[PDB]
Design a protein around this ligand. Structure first.
Ligand SMILES: O=C(NCCSCc1ccc(Cl)cc1)c1ccco1
Length: 209
């Protein structure tokens, strides 16, 4: 069973702005997603201070980067707090509404796309390099769900029947044809060392076989 939802008009037209605007500094997408993973890991670590059973679904707090040249996908996995179904549909969209509005206001005042993280909507920078984004997430209080959107005004949510994750969030970036450079090991290392050197969690860059 697949449910189809519409983006709020503000989020939809920001996504099209990220897709259609000529902006060469696309590498910042990785910084925003890694930063999003770092925030989710901080959340579960803090909550586990007053409730250690919240780590029964996994005690390791880390970030994995998985390039796949055959599928043309780049996957960012974290063992953070994860997201519930209401997070995917209601809660985060409400936050992204006001954050998107403020971001596009600044973009006309001279700001550029790289400052998207200051408005809390850094996730949508994934569409600088991806034509489709899939989000697999598992929260301690909810089932495993699969969110997905190729922009165009809508997204889908379904119960995930794939590999159980224990806890956390998996962001799968189906890259554009001309953005295969972010599947190369040396390029990812250069971006991580440039924008995410001080992230307080281990970042493991998986090598292909
Ligand atoms: O994008 C939507 N839902 C899935 C969000 S998961 C990635 C994410 C996206 C934005 C932010 Cl600020 C944080 C995390 C949406 C939009 C309207 C209803 O839902």
């Amino acid at each position: 069973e697949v449910e189809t939802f519409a983006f709020q008009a503000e989020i939809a037209q920001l996504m099209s702005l990220i897709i259609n605007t000529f902006y060469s500094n696309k590498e910042i997408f990785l910084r925003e997603l890694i930063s999003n993973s770092s925030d989710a890991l901080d959340k579960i670590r803090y909550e586990s201070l007053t409730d250690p059973s919240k780590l029964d679904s996994g005690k390791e707090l880390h970030i994995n980067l998985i390039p796949n040249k055959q599928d043309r996908t780049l996957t960012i996995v974290d063992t953070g707090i994860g997201m519930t179904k209401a997070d995917l549909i209601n809660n985060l969209g409400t936050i992204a509404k006001s954050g998107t509005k403020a971001f596009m206001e600044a973009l006309q005042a001279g700001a550029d796309i790289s400052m998207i993280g200051q408005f809390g909507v850094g996730f949508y920078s994934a569409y600088l390099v991806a034509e489709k984004v899939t989000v697999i997430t598992k929260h301690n209080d909810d089932e495993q769900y699969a969110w997905e959107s190729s922009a165009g005004g809508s997204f889908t949510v379904r119960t995930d029947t794939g590999e159980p994750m224990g806890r956390g969030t998996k962001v799968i970036l189906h890259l554009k044809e001309d953005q295969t450079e972010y599947l190369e090991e040396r390029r990812i290392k250069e971006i991580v060392k440039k924008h995410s050197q001080f992230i307080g969690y281990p970042i493991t860059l998986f090598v292909e076989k």
